[PDB]
Amino acid sequence: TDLQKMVMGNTKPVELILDGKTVAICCATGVFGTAYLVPRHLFAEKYDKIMLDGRAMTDSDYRVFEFEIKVKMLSDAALMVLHRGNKVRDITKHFRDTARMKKGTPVVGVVNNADVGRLIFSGEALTYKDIVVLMDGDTMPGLFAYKAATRAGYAGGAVLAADTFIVGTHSAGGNGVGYCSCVSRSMLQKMKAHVD
Amino acid sequence: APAKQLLNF
């Protein structure tokens, strides 16, 4: 699958720095231009600089757009757009609306961070959840669950599910099941023209 | 309940 290739190549490691020391780790999945999908809860941490693929930047180097996602809310999938940078492959055409998973179907999470390096995890789909409450008392909308073995740091990694496609970015997990924030191709498309 | 999986230090 050239797709598994494309996505793997767009996934870059992220690191938050505070007082010269690394204080957080996760992944970023390039979607087009210099736009990257990233866990929104990532910005809830205190930091001085953000390192994307070894490149250190400050808040004056990019913009972070959030997603309204209608339920009955802010999704955990934020889009980080660098003012300048090296282009990534445009894979928005691999997200969907024009379909939907189904309990059982194969699931593949793509990771690339500083804790474990490049890696892939597989599991089986479950269902789509409108809201999931985390163990810290927080909540997250539009999530797709799946049977998988995940760990801290996978957040932001791409999750794939005969034709293959991209569901969204990994956000949370636990006791054998993982959750990713879903992303529609149209929302990414509208976001592409907005950032031009 | 699941936990946010951003690796914190």
Instruction: Please tell me whether residues A98 and A165 are part of one structural domain.
Output: yes
Between chain A and chain B, how many beta carbons pairs sit less than 8 Å apart?
A: 71
State the DSSP code for A125. E
**Residue A187's closest CA among A68, A35, A89, A90?**
A68
Count Cα atoms within 13 angstroms, Cβ side, for A155.
Answer: 27
Decide: A129 and A168 in contact? Cβ < 8 Å. Answer: no
Q: Which domain holds residue A37?
A: 1-90
A36/A12 Cα distance (integer angstroms): 9
Domain termination site, one of A58, A90, A122: A90
> How far from A132 is each of A17, A28, A77, CA to CA, in Å?
29, 22, 14
Q: Tell me the technique behind this structure.
A: X-ray
Instruction: Identify all chain A residues contacting B7, using CB atoms and an 8 Å cutoff.
Output: 24-26, 113, 115, 152-153, 155
**Total structural domains in chain A?**
2
